[PDB]
Each structure stands twice: as C-alpha cells, then as structure tokens.
Design a protein around this motif. Structure first.
Motif, PDB file in Angstrom:
ATOM      1  N   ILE A   1       0.859  -1.182   0.000  1.00 26.02           N
ATOM      2  CA  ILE A   1       0.000   0.000   0.000  1.00 26.02           C
ATOM      3  C   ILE A   1       0.894   1.231   0.000  1.00 26.02           C
ATOM      4  N   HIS A   2       0.469   2.266  -0.723  1.00 22.62           N
ATOM      5  CA  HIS A   2       1.138   3.562  -0.759  1.00 22.62           C
ATOM      6  C   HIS A   2       0.235   4.598  -0.103  1.00 22.62           C
ATOM      7  N   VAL A   3       0.749   5.285   0.914  1.00 26.56           N
ATOM      8  CA  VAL A   3       0.009   6.383   1.532  1.00 26.56           C
ATOM      9  C   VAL A   3       0.208   7.625   0.665  1.00 26.56           C
ATOM     10  N   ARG A   4      -0.890   8.131   0.104  1.00 26.38           N
ATOM     11  CA  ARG A   4      -0.868   9.283  -0.800  1.00 26.38           C
ATOM     12  C   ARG A   4      -1.181  10.529   0.018  1.00 26.38           C
ATOM     13  N   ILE A   5      -0.130  11.265   0.386  1.00 30.70           N
ATOM     14  CA  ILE A   5      -0.289  12.429   1.251  1.00 30.70           C
ATOM     15  C   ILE A   5      -1.012  13.531   0.491  1.00 30.70           C
ATOM     16  N   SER A   6      -1.990  14.147   1.153  1.00 32.11           N
ATOM     17  CA  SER A   6      -2.796  15.216   0.581  1.00 32.11           C
ATOM     18  C   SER A   6      -2.971  16.308   1.630  1.00 32.11           C
ATOM     19  N   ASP A   7      -3.317  17.512   1.162  1.00 34.22           N
ATOM     20  CA  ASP A   7      -3.507  18.684   2.020  1.00 34.22           C
ATOM     21  C   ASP A   7      -2.208  19.103   2.716  1.00 34.22           C
ATOM     22  N   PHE A   8      -1.072  18.902   2.059  1.00 40.06           N
ATOM     23  CA  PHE A   8       0.207  19.380   2.574  1.00 40.06           C
ATOM     24  C   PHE A   8       0.222  20.914   2.530  1.00 40.06           C
TER      25      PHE A   8
END
Ligand SMILES: Nc1ncnc2c1ncn2[C@@H]1O[C@H](COP(=O)(O)OP(=O)(O)NP(=O)(O)O)[C@@H](O)[C@H]1O
Ligand SMILES: [Mg+2]
Ligand SMILES: [Zn+2]
Ligand SMILES: [Zn+2]
Lengths: 665, 258, 655
Positions: free
Chosen positions: C121-128
């Motif tokens: 699984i890849h954690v897709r960082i958002s709202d940086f």
DNA sequence: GGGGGGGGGGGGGGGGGGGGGTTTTTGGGGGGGGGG
DNA sequence: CCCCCCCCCCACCCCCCCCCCCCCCCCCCCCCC
C-alpha cells in the motif's frame, strides 16, 4: 558480530532517552532515576569498552548525542541553580548527578591513543571516533560561552573550601578529575589521516587530509576559542589561585595542563618584536620581489612560439632546448637541461603523543586575536610570577623518583613544559627589565639539571629519539638561561664542571646522528650546538679539546642537510649556521672539510636571484662568507689540482695522504 | 561532498569539489582496501543554488554594428534569478577559466572529441582547453504591492512627510493634472485622462467568478499636425511596466501573443 | 531491562530528536518501531468530530475499490502527534517507507488476505500546507516533501520498471539478493558479495518484479509565470497507481519529493558539479466529485417544481436579464442524450449555441462563466484559433523523429464544452474546421501518412457580433451576419442579443450593475470560516442554488442521467417542425433543417436532465418547443415577426 | 672502528587484461504583396 | 481597403590505461678483522 553492535547501539539510544529532556511548561529537565541512568552509562564504558577494549559505546554515545544534548544542559542548569543560590544562600541530590555528568565528560573526552597494543576494533574506530571528540570540544567551549567550565570550577571549589587537612581521598580524586576535564578539553585536536598501504598509490595521491566533521571548523577548535571561553569562565583565575594554594596529589595533571596550553604556541608570537595593514603591504612587496624574479624565468611570447636553442658544449657536440629566454642566458639553459631529466634517486621513509613544537612545520604560528593574546600572556605571566618555581619543584621532586616507570608521554611533556616557560621568561625579561630571571630560579637548582641530564642520557642510550629531542630542547633552554645568569651575576661554575667529559661527548654525538631525522630534530641539534659553543666560549676543559669533537664530517652533513631547507628556514637560523661556519672555516681553519660540492651547489642556489631576500642580513652573511670561501678554494686549487677531483668526494681518511689533502704542505 | 565506502561503512566528509564531480581517492579506515568505490551521502553533503546566465555586449556599445560579443556568467546562492531575459545588468565577481570537464576525465562520460595543454597526469594523452566565465557574487539591474502597509513601510520618513504634505493640500487634484506631460502645452482633458489611467479602477472578482475590468482604456484622436505622440512618449517614459508600438508596424500576433 | 528487538520509546522522546539528522533518527530501530506504533495509532484512533475513524472508513473504501493507494490528509497528522507530521515533511523517503508498511498492516487487519490483492500500500499524502512554484524550488528543498503547481507539458508512455531485482554474477554462486530500484539511478554492483570481486552482471531470471512508470514534464502555468520571463519546468516521475492520472495540457497540483542525482551529461555541458533534479510524485490533483450527502442534496433539490427555473436563474447570476441566453447555456451545459441506432447510425447529443449580438451585452462574460462552470472546458477567441489548433494537428515528433498527432481544443474538451468568443473574427479557413466535430462529433485527420478519426464530443458555444458591428432588425438573419447556412444550421440554438435604449429596463439593469459592483468589492468561529460564510451570504442574494452545488449537480446530471423520450407528442413536434420549415422558406431566415428537429429532442432531454428525471415529461418538451420557436421567431425582421409570433403561438402559449 | 655481507623493504618495470571507438518533404504559422 | 494567396522559415582491431606481480637495488644492521 555486528548483531552485538546493533544491540549495543539500541541500548545506548534507550539510555539516551532515559537521561532527561526539555520541558515545555525551554528548560532542560532530568529524567526519572537519572542518577541510576548516568551510573549505568558509566558502567557501560567500563563494562564493555574498557574491559573488552572496543570503543563501541564511545561511538554509540556520540551517535545519540548524549553529551551535547543532555549532560551539558544538566551541568549548565545545575551551575545556574548553584550560582543563583550563592547570592541568596534539593541541591544535596542534584550535586550528585552534576558530579556524575563531569565523570562522564572526562570519560568521553579522554585522550585517545592508538598503538600496536590497541585492539583491531580500536585502531579501526580511531579515526571517526576522534571527530566526535572535536564536536565535544566545540560544544563545550561554545555552549552559553562555556558555562559548563564554571560548573566544573564550582565542583572543584566545593572541595577547595574544606581544608588541606579535611579533603578525603575521594575529594582529592574529585579535584584531580576536574583537572583532567580541563586537560582533556584543551587536548582534543584533529586526527591524522591514517592511510592503508597494502595497495599502491593511484595516479593522484590523497585528495585532502581534512578530518573535521561538517559542523566543525578549525576556528571552533583554535586556541582563540579556548582562551576566550576560559577567560569568560575565569578558568585562568581558578588555575592561578590553585597553584597559589600549592602547600601535591594533583601536581601531575596541573603540570600537564600547562604543557597542553604551551605545546604548540611560539613565545615570540605574544610580543610585537593601520599596523596590520602596513604589514600586509610589506608582505605584498615581499612576494612582488618573487614576481619580478619569476618574470625573468618566463617567456616574453606565447608557449607555442618555440624557438630552439642549441648549446654546443666546450667539446664538438650539441644539446637542444626550447627555452625562449634561455636563448640569451646559458645559466637558464643549463639548469633547464638539468631539470629536464626524468630520473630521480629513490628516497626513504622516517603514536602515543600529540603534535607540538617537537614536530610541527617550522613556521607554524598560532594566530591570536589581540584580546586572546592579552588574556593568555597575562595568565602565563601571573603563572610565572606565582606558580612556576613551586610547581616545577613539586613535579621534579616527584620525578627524581620513579624515572624507570616514567612513561614516554610523561617524559616529553615534562621536558617541553620546562623548556617553554624558561624560554618565555628569558624573552619577557629581555623585553622588560621589570621581569626577573630569578622568577624561574627552580630551573637552575641542581636537582633539575640532574633530572634533565638523566632523561637525556637515558633516552639517548635507549634510542628514544622523541625524548632525546625533547631533552635536547630542554638543554638548549637550560644553557640559554645559564648564560644569562652568568652575565647577571656560582651555579654556572658548578654546571660548567658537571657538563665535562661524558656530557661533552653525548652532546657532541647528537648532531652526528641528527642528519637522519626530521628538520626539527636537526634544528634542535643546531640550536643546542650554538648554545653549547657560546656557553663554552663564555667560560673560556680546554676549548680546542671540546670543539674538535664537533668539527667532523657527520656534523657537517647535519649542518648541510639542515641548510638545504634555507627557503623555509628563518633568517636567524641561517645566521646561526653561518656563524658556526664562520668559527669552523675562518677561525678554526679546518677549511678542507668544507671544500665539497654539496655546499657549492647550496651556496649558488641561495645566492641565486631565486634564493634569499636581496636585503636580508642572512644574505649579507652568505655573501660575506662566500667571497672568502671562494678565495680560499681558489688558493687551495692553485696549490693542488688534485683537489679539482677531491672536491667531488669525502676527504681521504687514509691519514698518510689525508694530512697532505687537508693542508697541502 | 560526503561519501560512504562500499566495502566498509566509513564516511569521508567535507570533500571539496573541482569542476568535475570529485570523489575520494583513499579510504580513511586503515583496515580498508578501497579506492574509488563510493556512494555519495546526499543528506550529509551540501549543495548550493547555481545558475548560468548568458550576457551579450550592450547594443549601444557595439562600435560599428558588428556582432555583439558574449560571455557566460555563473550566479550562485542568494544572487540567482535576479537577472532576467532582456534585462540590462551590472555584475561583479571573478573572471575565471572553466575547463572542458569531459576532457579532464569524468564518471559516466566519454571525453569530448583550439589546441589545449597536455602532459598533466590526469589527461594522459588528452589536451585540456578552457572557456572564460564570470563567477558573479553580486547583481543589479540598470535597465503590484497593492496594500498600504507593504508600500509605506519601504519609504524614507522624508518621503512619508512629502506624502503627508501632498495629501494635506485640498486642491492637489489640479496639481496632479498639471504635472502630467509637462513638456506638452494645453490639452487639460487629455492630461486628466492620463492621470486617471495611471490611477486605474479597482479590479473585482464576482461570487460567480466573473471578472470586472479595473484598467481604463483611453483614445487620443488627433491630426498628425497635433502634438499627439508626446502623450505616448511621456507615459511610456514615466509609467512602470509599459510599452510603445506603432499601429501598422505591429501585426495581430505581434500585439497579443505569437 | 527490555528485549532489544522490541525496545520502544514515548512520544515526548520522539520529539526529543537526538540523532545528527532526521533520517538518522527515523532509521534508528527503537525509534522506527515507535514510529510504526505511532502511525498505526493515528490510522486507528484519529476520528472525525462525528466520532467515526476517518482512516477506518478510507481503508474500508480502499478495499472496496481494490486500490493500492490510501489517501492520508497531512492536516489530520498535524492535528494529532504532530512530530510525525514534521518528520514526514523533513524526511519523506524514510517516513513514507514506514507509513506504507503501517498502512498495509492496518488494511490487512481490516481486510484479511488483502496481501493477495496487493502486496503493498502507498500512503498518498494530501492537504500538505505549503506550496512552491517551479521558479521557487531551491537547494533547501532537496529530499524534502514539496507541493507544486504546473501544466503537464509532455507525457511519455506507460512502461514497466524494475522494482525488486536480483542479479546474476557470472562467477561463483551466481544469484545476488534483491536490490530495490529507485527513480534516478541504475543498480551499481561495485563487487559481487559472494566472491568479493568485480565482475559482469545480468538481471536474474529466477525472480524479478515490475512496477508501472511514466515521466511527465511539469511546466509553469502560462498565466503564473511573470510576463517576459521564460517558463521553468521539472521532470515529474509517476509510479504504480499514479500513471495516466493526467493528460497533456491539464493544469495539475503535485505533491512529491524533490530529489536530485549526479548526471555526467549536465556536468559535461555546464562544467560544474551540478546535479539533475526531479519530483518523485506521491499525489496528483487536477473539485467535481461528491459525497453521499452531496448526492442526497442533489436528489432533494431535484424534486422542486421550479428546479429548471432555479437552475436557469442560477446560470451566470451576476448578469442581469438575458434569460433566453441563460436557458440556452443551461441546455447546452446539461446536454441531450447521445444515441446510437443499433450501431448503424450515431446521433449527436451535444447542443450547440450561438450568441449573436451587439457590443457590451455580456456575451464574452457568459462564455467566461461557462468556462468556469463546465467539468471540461476550453476557450479560444477569434483570431487566436487556427484550423488545426481547433480540431487536431500532426507534428514531427522531436524525440521519436516520426509523425504524431496533437489534439486540438475539440479533443481537449471531448465530453465537455468548447468556447469560441468573437466567432465572427475567425478566418473562414479556421472556422470551417469546426464542421465535422460540431455535427459528426469526430475529427478525421489524414496527413503525413497518419490516417485516423478522433472523438470530439463537444457542445460548442460561440459569441459573435453582426456584420458592421451592430444588429439591424430590418434585415433577416442571413444579411445580419456573414455566416453561411451549413455552419448556422449546426448552431442549433440561436440567441440574438440587441442593445436597445429602454428607460425602465436600463434603470433596472444599471441598478443591478452598481449593486453588483459593490457586492463584488474586495473589502466587502475563525476568520477563514467567517469569510466563507460571508461569501455564501453574498451569493444567496442572486443565486437560488449554491454555485459550488451547481457545478457538482451539472456533473452528476451529465454522468448519471440519460432521459428517454416517451409518450411523445409526435404530432405536435411534427406540426412545429413542419410550420417552422414552411415559414423558414423566407430566403434570409434562420435555415430550419432536420438537425433542428433533433435539436428540439436534445433540448427536451437536457431539461429532463436538469430534473434528474430518466423520462422526458410533456413540460420538458413544451419548454424545448418554446425555446426553439422563440429562437426562430426572435431572428426574424420586424416586418413579419408579429405575424409569425401570432401564428406560432398555438404551439407555445398553450404552455 | 670500519668495511663487508646478508637480509628485508620498497620501488619500478613489464606484462596482461579490458574497454572504447545534410538535403528533402510536409505541415504549420506568420508576414508580405497583389487584385477587385 | 480587405481578403486571399503565396512565400519564407523552421523542425573487430588497435591504443590507452590500469593493475598486479616479481625482481632487483639500496639501505641498515651485525659480525669480523
Ligand atoms: N446584463 C449585464 N449585466 C451585467 N454586466 C453586464 C451586462 N451586459 C453587459 N455587462 C458588462 O459589460 C462588459 C462587457 O461584457 P462582454 O461580455 O465583453 O460583452 P459582449 O457581449 O461580449 N460585447 P462584445 O465583446 O463587444 O461582443 C462586462 O464587464 C459586463 O459586466
Ligand atoms: Mg465579446
Ligand atoms: Zn572502506
Ligand atoms: Zn561473484
């Protein structure tokens, strides 16, 4: 195996979290069971790294930053507690963790040495482990202007308060431990780039010797930072009043601290002997002389212009060179035809002590700021004016005993300590009449001469060249002082009978062996020889009997090999060599021994425009010597065409013709 | 630069860099056998901002309309991106030679293929050549902040007081119009218009996203006898971020964008 | 005191960073184990204020979608255990490596045997929170997480790339353990570990594993780069799930790692030790999606008896009047139903609209609004549009040295709108490129050996002035405007916009305009929340439904709803078309043609679409007839318009 | 006490292995010129 | 004056090199005269 190493590093990291940390309510705050954690870390040092000879904890503790990020905060805030309270007076407990922090600092700052007896792990880890001690030295000096130093003196004052009678062996140990902390903090210095030599060198050598970690600069480590932080924490005041209170369990570390201050600083740097900008202009003019010299050694047109000279020799044969300026100057053509050779003769090679005046580059100065220079010079002035004679008497009264077990480091640091301050007070007294030669009188008490003589004689007999060199230096300053007090006036007559016979012979034989050793070894041999000769002349058992022991070809080889460095020697040293030549050649008239081509080449190379300063006093002496030398050589050749060939060789030790070669009837 | 050895985890650090990417020749570990097998530690090593900019001889300084001579300028650190294309600039810094780094030997690069200089051991049979470049430590140009605070807080207090003595004047409005295009006589209405063009309207964005124009568009109809182009020459000389162009000389593309 | 392989730390210890660098701290295994527990605790126990675990719901959704990606919001990590958020910003390569393993563990807990569906699984960082322009990237950003905006200038193909690779030594025991491949460098094997010597090497045949790969050139957006300056750019690398999430010419916002590597080419040509750089993407953004509650809100408002009129009033709410234009735009923007008769005959669903009329009548502003509101949109004024720039073009590919296609505006806006402002200013060779895409909904290029047909499913809305700059109601349409019958017939709604002086109408319009200007003035519970609330308070003065709701409602109605014709008033539409054809025999009139008959049906379908109704009611058809008849009647000269409107009234004023 | 011989280290040379080494057509946009 | 056309410019052996191994030479130490 490395599984043990990762287990170790994990343990040390967890301990690093147990020591303490900042509190947001920023202030540092100790951890729960903090004293037990500090004790366990001290345990780790003994349990693993000492008893198994590893230094793995010493590496891991640097990885997890315990010194910089826990122990110095603990000590500085504890110092702030005590100093703030001192104006107003559970300290009885926090004092214990402060003491244990200082114990850990002495451990982590302990001077590392590698020898054949050091383990494989130790000699492997040495190079990188030194770097963390340099980080420690930077942080210790810089952090809050080094208030940890004030914490250390407070820990010492808390036994100095209780009497000389009162202090238990534990109190004596605590004071000695504080001295070891100061010594260590002075003593950390960058490591040496220790290359492996199994595999041959590539087409380019080592890229750089620089060993400093990226957050350190050499200015962070320089003596200016030490002197500044020590002044701003009154470490100098502590040391001065401590030596004033010497009325001896701690005397060896205190001596050692003064050695570690002095070991690499030149005395004349502390004396003058727009001004900086004016001197910069002087420097620029001095190198501009080199510019107008190299210009004549440079083509007036581009390198591809390439006109060909041919040198026809005195015989019917021709050589060829491309030197565009050489077309009008056979001097250039000849030395270029010499430099063109691809051949070079192959040349030969040649630790538990630090770098010093014993082994630095001969011109290696320390660049004090003026305030640091003032603070340092006034500190050592007050030391001479208070602590010198008693401290030297204390340690020499020890060191007359236990000479057999005096480790090499202890010997060399002692001899250097003696020599440095004797030389300094002589210089300060030559500058100021207010400064007294007798303020270093302990140097001349015969016990001291006996001990320094024993160290030199034993080191020579034992072929310990390091201590031999240091004792030679100490002898030079002892004789320097002796000549001064001969003028100032009984002890001079006494030592002038004690250095008879075996000591004459030994001193004569140092410069026979000195030609094999480093430039500083030779320099100290020459300096000793000049000092000895001027002392014996001031006395003047027989003068000719002593000097004949010096005037022999191995000594001349040492003198020539020292003088090969003339571009890098100082003018006074060239003066000293040429005064020796003046005596030997002009006055003692053993002129045959100097008719040898090594000297002839060396004379031309320094008298060439590419050599000495045109206005130098040493150039004046070389010119003055060379006119007379050439006249005498011309005379001897006119009286002996055999000497045209004899010039090439060592003179004939077969005396039956050797006398004729030497004098020519 | 900083490198970790391949066959042991020891680290070389503070490695100075030549024009070529420079890696260590010897391992610091006296146990280790390594030469020239390394991994660069990107985190420990330090980079710098770097920017080459090409400059040409000024158009008004060329002697007889021949080709302008050119030079390569290197900007670094805080000084980067202060230049701009078409800007006229003054730099200061070091005149330097830059070698042909390919000819000097370079990892992963076959060398390149004027007569250079040779015999240097790094080159073997190859001969090295140099460009000149200028390593500039400093730059200036020599050729909208729409909030009161960010403008006012840059001014000198003298300038603040001049602003105050101007806004104090009840009839400054006339003095502004008479300060427009002072070299052209009369035509008060045009001057009033040019003032009310350099002072634009307030640009607005609606809740639906539809924009309203703030800029003001003016036309100055005049016979070629009239002193008409003087207004354009004035405002292009005066007003920041402005241009002059001629109606037939410029095409539709040349006007909007090509 | 503790098992060294399970020694762990407190959170305050994690804030008490005491390695030399962040990466050295993240990789310290006691710290690493603690970080694993920390992020796992975050994914378990972080909640919405409703008490639901957000990452519980997202993991549930992830498995339902069989996705490889878990969307993590950075602000949720800044809100709880913020030291982890700092680490994620300062050292993303290590931290994402841990956080991925944690995310896989969490979903494997939530969905047992998800390892069979995806091993990773890849954690897709958002709202940086912090953003840079490509001009703004610097050395201090290296190996940091960054957030960047640009236009995807050039997208390469999708390739397999090695992920975990074993190698064969040709000496000794051949197989070498799996190296993990990165985005910048080939695996270098300085020596074989098994024989501790140099050698040749090959990729192993026993096992190797692949991941998708795609480079993208990301460039400064043309309005964002200051004028005169050149556009800066960087190479963006897309891996695994991220390939083909964007296509050329789209503006995107990219979250990724700004990395660099030695490249001998850059050094060679520049003469300094200067490194190439990339952004390794970890998230890509293009706003038109919706939640289950948003879906329910669309279903709720669709029941309203006035919903067509509330939509129409909500079209371009800050433009006064022009309800006919707003109707035409609404019909176009919802569109009809595209149809295909047994595969043997395909029929246009898009509705094309022409805004013909006088200056200063908001036509360009209407088109800019539609560019604002439509889910895929492109805008191209007049002389700015070439024939191939509208349909498609062929270029000699600079890196492949062969011919390739480049899609024009009507390719970019496929399943969308294309907006040609100042349509009368186009060159006629540019204009006549529109025809195939505007009716057959395709582009058929045959050039340079390329032969193929592209899809161009656009509703085109165009704005034009009449001949001479102003309308003339004493002339019929064909004499008002230079456009020929084949292009006029394709614009199957016509709106004629006349600027007439009319005292109370101008009074009302001027009142509305000045009100709009103060209502749009820039100066006119936290402050950001209050300001958004004030914006909503301003907006409800003129928009009967929220504009943000209207965009998602349009997109929903377009994608979900396909109204059937039924119960058809066949005789009414037949009589309407027959009468329109008969009265259109007037030589200059709007040229009624069979595509207008189909236009009535498209418009009725669009009205049923506005109601989210899968069947077209009589009301939808009657409104469609009213629009088409009024559009026809309005185009007639005054000499006949009253008589014609009276004659046609029987079909339309019955509604 | 000096000179010779033996033994060890260090350097240089030679050999062996390895790797590198422009016009012509088609399409598009923009500019310039000519005819109604 | 406007529009359309049309014109222009542009995209497998051989050498250099590097590494490894062996021998020789030079220095130092110890013994013998
Ligand atoms: N009914 C209206 N309500 C609000 N603003 C309007 C209205 N009609 C015109 N405007 C304003 O008129 C300006 C010009 O609008 P615009 O869209 O360019 O008109 P247009 O129909 O395109 N005229 P033209 O470009 O000459 O064909 C804008 O700033 C609008 O706000
Ligand atoms: Mg318009
Ligand atoms: Zn190594
Ligand atoms: Zn192998």
């Amino acid at each position: 195996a490395d599984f043990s190493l990762t287990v170790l590093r994990a343990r040390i990291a967890l301990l690093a979290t147990a020591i303490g940390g900042p509190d947001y309510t920023p202030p540092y705050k100790l951890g729960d069971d903090c004293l037990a954690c500090l004790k366990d870390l001290k345990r780790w040092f003994k349990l693993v790294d000492d008893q198994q000879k590893r230094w793995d904890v010493a590496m891991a503790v640097a990885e997890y930053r315990i010194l910089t990020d826990d122990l110095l905060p603990i000590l500085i805030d504890w110092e702030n507690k005590c100093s703030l309270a001192a104006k107003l007076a559970n300290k009885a407990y926090y004092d214990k963790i402060a003491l244990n922090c200082l114990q850990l600092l002495v451990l982590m700052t302990w001077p590392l040495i590698v020898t054949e007896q050091s383990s494989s792990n130790q000699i492997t880890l040495y190079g990188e482990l030194k770097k963390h001690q340099l980080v420690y030295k930077k942080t210790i000096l810089s952090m809050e202007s080094g208030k940890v130093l004030r914490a250390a003196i407070r820990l010492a004052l808390d036994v100095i308060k209780i009497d000389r009678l009162s202090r238990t062996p534990r109190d004596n140990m605590v004071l000695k431990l504080v001295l070891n902390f100061f010594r260590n903090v002075i003593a950390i210095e960058p490591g040496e780039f220790t290359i492996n030599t199994k595999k041959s060198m590539p087409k380019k050598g080592i890229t750089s010797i620089d060993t400093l970690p990226p957050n350190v600069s050499m200015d962070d480590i320089s003596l200016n930072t030490v002197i500044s932080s020590f002044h701003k924490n009154k470490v100098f005041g502590f040391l001065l009043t401590l030596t004033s209170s010497l009325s001896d369990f701690i005397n060896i570390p205190l001596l050692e601290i003064m050695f570690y201050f002095t070991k690499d600083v030149n005395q004349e740097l502390l004396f003058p002997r727009t001004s900086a900008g004016f001197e910069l202009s002087k420097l620029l003019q001095k190198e501009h002389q080199m510019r107008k010299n190299v210009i004549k050694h440079t083509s007036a047109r581009h390198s591809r212009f390439g006109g060909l000279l041919s040198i026809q020799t005195p015989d019917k044969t021709r050589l060829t060179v491309s030197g565009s300026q050489a077309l009008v100057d056979e001097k250039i053509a000849l030395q270029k035809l010499d430099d063109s050779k691809k051949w070079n003769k192959r040349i030969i090679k040649k630790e538990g002590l630090p770098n010093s005046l014993l082994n630095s580059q001969t011109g290696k100065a320390i660049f004090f700021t003026e305030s640091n220079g003032k603070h340092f010079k006034e500190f050592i002035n007050n030391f001479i004016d208070s602590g010198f004679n008693i401290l030297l008497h204390s340690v020499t009264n020890y060191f007359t005993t236990e000479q057999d077990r005096m480790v090499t480091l202890e010997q060399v640091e002692y001899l250097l300590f003696f020599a440095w301050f004797v030389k300094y007070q002589l210089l300060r007294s030559k500058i100021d009449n207010s400064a007294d030669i007798k303020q270093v009188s302990e140097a001349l008490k015969e016990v001291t001469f006996i001990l320094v003589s024993s160290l030199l004689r034993s080191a020579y007999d034992l072929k310990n060249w390091t201590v031999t060199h240091a004792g030679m230096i100490a002898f030079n300053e002892l004789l320097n002082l002796v000549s001064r007090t001969k003028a100032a006036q009984d002890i001079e007559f006494i030592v002038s009978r004690l250095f008879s016979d075996e000591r004459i012979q030994l001193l004569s034989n140092l410069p026979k062996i000195g030609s094999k050793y480093s430039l500083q070894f030779m320099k100290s041999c020459i300096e000793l020889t000049h000092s000895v000769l001027k002392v014996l002349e001031q006395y003047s058992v027989n003068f000719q009997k002593v000097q004949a022991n010096y005037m022999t070809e191995p000594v001349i080889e040492t003198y020539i090999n020292f003088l090969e460095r003339f571009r890098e020697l100082e003018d006074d040293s060239i003066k000293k060599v040429f005064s020796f030549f003046h005596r030997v050649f002009v006055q003692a008239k053993e002129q045959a021994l100097l008719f040898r081509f090594d000297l002839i080449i060396l004379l031309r190379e320094m008298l060439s425009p590419d050599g000495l300063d045109r206005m130098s006093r040493s150039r004046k002496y070389v010119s003055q010597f060379s006119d007379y030398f050439l006249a005498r050589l011309k005379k001897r050749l006119k009286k002996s065409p055999a000497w045209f060939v004899g010039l090439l060789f060592p003179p004939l030790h077969n005396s039956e013709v050797g006398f004729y070669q030497r004098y020519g009837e | 630069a900083s490198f970790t050895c391949d066959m042991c985890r020891a680290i070389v650090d503070n490695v100075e860099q030549s024009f070529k990417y420079t890696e260590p020749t010897f391992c610091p570990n006296p146990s280790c056998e390594n030469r020239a097998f390394w991994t660069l530690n990107v985190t420990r090593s330090r980079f710098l901002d770097w920017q080459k900019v090409r400059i040409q001889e000024n158009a008004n300084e060329i002697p007889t309309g021949s080709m302008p001579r050119t030079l390569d300028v290197i900007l670094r650190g805080d000084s980067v991106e202060r230049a701009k294309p078409g800007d006229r600039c003054k730099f200061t810094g070091v005149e330097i030679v830059v070698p042909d780094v390919t000819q000097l030997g370079l990892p992963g690069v076959k060398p390149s293929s004027n007569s250079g200089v040779t015999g240097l051991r790094s080159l073997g049979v190859r001969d090295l050549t140099y460009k000149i470049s200028f390593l500039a430590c400093h730059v200036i140009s020599i050729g909208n902040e729409r909030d009161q605070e960010v403008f006012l807080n840059s001014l000198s207090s003298d300038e603040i007081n001049e602003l105050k003595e101007m806004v104090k004047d009840e009839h400054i409005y006339d003095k502004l119009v008479r300060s427009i295009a002072p070299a052209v006589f009369g035509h008060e209405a045009v001057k009033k218009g040019i003032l009310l063009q350099m002072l634009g309207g307030v640009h607005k964005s609606t809740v639906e996203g539809i924009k309203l124009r703030g800029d003001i568009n003016i036309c100055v109809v005049g016979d070629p006898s009239t002193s008409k182009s003087q207004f354009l020459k004035y405002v292009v000389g005066f007003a920041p971020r402005s241009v002059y162009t001629s109606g037939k000389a410029s095409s539709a593309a040349g006007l909007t964008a090509a | 005191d503790i098992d060294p392989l399970r020694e762990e730390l407190t959170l305050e210890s994690l804030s008490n960073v005491k390695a030399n660098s962040y990466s050295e701290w993240i990789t310290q295994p006691n710290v690493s184990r603690t970080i694993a527990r920390e992020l796992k605790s975050f994914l378990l126990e972080y909640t919405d204020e409703t008490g639901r675990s957000v990452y519980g719901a997202r993991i549930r959704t992830l498995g339902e979608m069989n996705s490889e990606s878990l969307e993590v919001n950075y602000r949720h990590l800044a809100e709880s255990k913020a030291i982890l958020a700092l680490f994620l910003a300062k050292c993303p390569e290590e931290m994402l490596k841990i956080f991925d393993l944690v995310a896989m563990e969490a979903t494997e807990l939530h969905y047992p045997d998800y390892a069979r569906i995806h091993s990773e699984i890849h954690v897709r960082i958002s709202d940086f929170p912090t953003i840079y322009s490509l001009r703004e990237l610097r050395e201090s950003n290296l190996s940091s997480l960054v957030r960047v905006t640009g236009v995807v200038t050039r997208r390469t193909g999708v390739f397999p790339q090695l992920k975990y690779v074993k190698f064969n030594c040709l000496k000794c025991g051949s197989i070498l353990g799996p190296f993990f491949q990165d985005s910048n460098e080939e695996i270098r094997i300085s020596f074989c570990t098994n024989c501790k010597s140099k050698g040749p090497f090959r990729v192993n045949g026993e096992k190797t594993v692949y991941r998708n790969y795609q480079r993208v050139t990301l460039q400064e957006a043309p309005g964002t780069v200051p004028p005169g300056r050149l556009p800066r750019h960087r190479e963006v690398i897309l891996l695994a799930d991220l390939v083909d999430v964007s296509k050329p010419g789209e503006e995107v916002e990219v979250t990724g790692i700004y990395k660099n590597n030695y490249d001998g080419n850059l050094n060679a040509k520049n003469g300094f030790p200067v490194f190439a750089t990339i952004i390794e993407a970890n998230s890509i953004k293009r706003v038109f999606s919706w939640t289950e509650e948003e879906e329910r809100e669309f279903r709720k408002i669709s029941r309203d008896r006035g919903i067509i009129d509330k939509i129409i009033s909500s079209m371009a709410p800050s433009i006064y009047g022009h309800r006919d234009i707003k109707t035409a735009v609404a019909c176009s923007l919802f569109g009809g139903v595209p149809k295909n008769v047994n595969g043997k005959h395909s029929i246009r669903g898009d509705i094309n609209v022409l805004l013909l009329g006088d200056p200063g009548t908001a036509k360009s502003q209407i088109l800019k609004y539609v560019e604002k509101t439509a889910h895929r949109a492109v805008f191209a004024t007049g002389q700015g549009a070439s024939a191939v720039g509208l349909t498609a073009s062929v270029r000699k590919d600079p890196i492949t040295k062969e011919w390739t296609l480049e899609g024009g505006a009507l390719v970019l806006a496929d399943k969308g709108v294309c907006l040609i402002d100042e349509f009368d200013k186009m060159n006629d060779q540019d204009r006549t490129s529109i025809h195939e895409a505007m009716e057959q909904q395709s582009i058929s290029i045959s050039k340079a050996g390329i032969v193929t047909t592209l899809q161009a499913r656009c509703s085109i809305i165009a704005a034009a002035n009449p001949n001479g700059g102003r309308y003339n109601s004493t002339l019929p349409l064909a004499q008002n405007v230079s456009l020929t019958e084949p292009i006029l017939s394709r614009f199957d709604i016509l709106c004629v916009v006349r600027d007439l002086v009319d005292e109370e109408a101008d009074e009302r319009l001027a009142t509305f305009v000045v009100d709009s200007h103060v209502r749009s003035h820039p100066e006119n519970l936290n402050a950001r929340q209050r300001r958004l609330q004030r914006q909503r308070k301003k907006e409800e003065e003129i928009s009967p439904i929220p504009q943000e709701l209207l965009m998602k409602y349009i997109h929903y109605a377009r994608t979900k709803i396909y109204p059937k014709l039924h119960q058809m008033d066949m005789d009414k539409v037949s009589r309407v078309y027959a009468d329109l054809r008969r009265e259109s025999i007037s030589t200059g009139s709007f040229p009624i043609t069979v595509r207008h008959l189909e236009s009535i049906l498209r418009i009725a379908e669009s009205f049923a679409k506005m109601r989210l109704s899968e069947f077209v009611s009589s009301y939808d058809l009657d409104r469609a007839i009213k629009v088409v008849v009024d559009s026809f009647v309005d185009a007639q000269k005054v000499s006949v318009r009253r008589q014609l409107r009276r004659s046609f009234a029987i079909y339309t004023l019955g509604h």
